[PDB]
Design a binder for this molecule. Structure first.
Ligand code: NA
Length: 268
């Protein structure tokens, strides 16, 4: 009968995903309406409030909005012109830098936003690019950057892995692959992937209404397992999903509107 408070480390396995809630979309009186992103490790001079938006190929513009009020009005505080075209599907902002795959390359670039400067470039060894290793619906999603509680990751595959998902933990400063895992999950058999507390999760489908989170790979054990967590698709097909470890929510983008999925983890 001796009782203790409910202990919690703040991280654990995913046990519940909520139904999608649609966020209010920002105003743009023009066409422009690219994917937007916030920094899970805000770094001065930016804050939790700061937003960035990718323009729309030759994608080379990134809009920066200091205040949510400026974001919601569609009025950037600064427009970044990047030194090389982007792959919009796998870019992320982390610790004050934009990390992105250079168009038609296997190279990840670190672009420091406050100095508008390339600080690191790293070819992902063996990484396929250009529809060599898509997810389950074509396009050019070969290389996918992700941020979780432990920092920056890259999701990809290689000819050596024969299409299996490979993940590498990246040094956020110099982009070295500090650790690599070769999973036994076939990349083209899932629609998308994200990472929470060091576990890789996959989305079964974006075009089925009642989809699931259907695989998990624990990087602490190297073991993959099947899951059946319900995952509701409610819109014009999401085109990408990002976990934000600061907000502890999943953000799904459908090319205009953003929805959020609440989650619950074990105390683990
Ligand atoms: Na993705």
């Amino acid at each position: 009968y001796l009782r203790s408070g409910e202990g919690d480390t703040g991280c654990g396995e995913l046990v519940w995903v909520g139904e999608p809630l649609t966020l209010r979309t920002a105003e743009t009186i023009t066409g422009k309406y690219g994917v937007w992103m916030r920094d899970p490790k805000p770094t001065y001079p930016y804050t939790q409030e700061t937003t960035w938006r990718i323009d729309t190929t030759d994608v080379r513009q990134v809009f920066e909005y200091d205040l949510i009020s400026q974001f919601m009005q569609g009025y950037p505080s600064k427009v970044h012109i990047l030194p090389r075209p982007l792959e919009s599907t796998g870019a992320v902002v982390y610790s004050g830098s934009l990390y992105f795959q250079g168009a038609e390359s296997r190279t990840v670039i670190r672009y420091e936003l406050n100095t508008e400067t390339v600080k690191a470039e790293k070819e992902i060894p063996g990484a396929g690019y250009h529809g060599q290793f898509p997810y389950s619906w074509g396009g050019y999603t070969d290389i996918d950057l992700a941020v979780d509680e432990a920092g920056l990751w890259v999701i990809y595959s290689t000819d050596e892995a024969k299409g299996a998902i490979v993940l590498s933990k990246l040094n956020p400063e110099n982009l070295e692959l500090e650790q690599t895992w070769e999973t036994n999950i076939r990349k083209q058999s899932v629609a998308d992937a994200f990472i929470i507390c060091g576990t890789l999760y996959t989305v079964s489908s974006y075009t089925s209404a009642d989809a699931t989170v259907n695989f998990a790979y624990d990087t602490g054990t190297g073991i993959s397992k099947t899951l059946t967590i319900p995952f509701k698709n409610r819109y014009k097909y999401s085109s990408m999903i990002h976990y934000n470890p600061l907000e502890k929510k999943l953000f799904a983008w459908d090319n205009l509107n953003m929805v959020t999925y609440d989650i619950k983890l074990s105390k683990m």
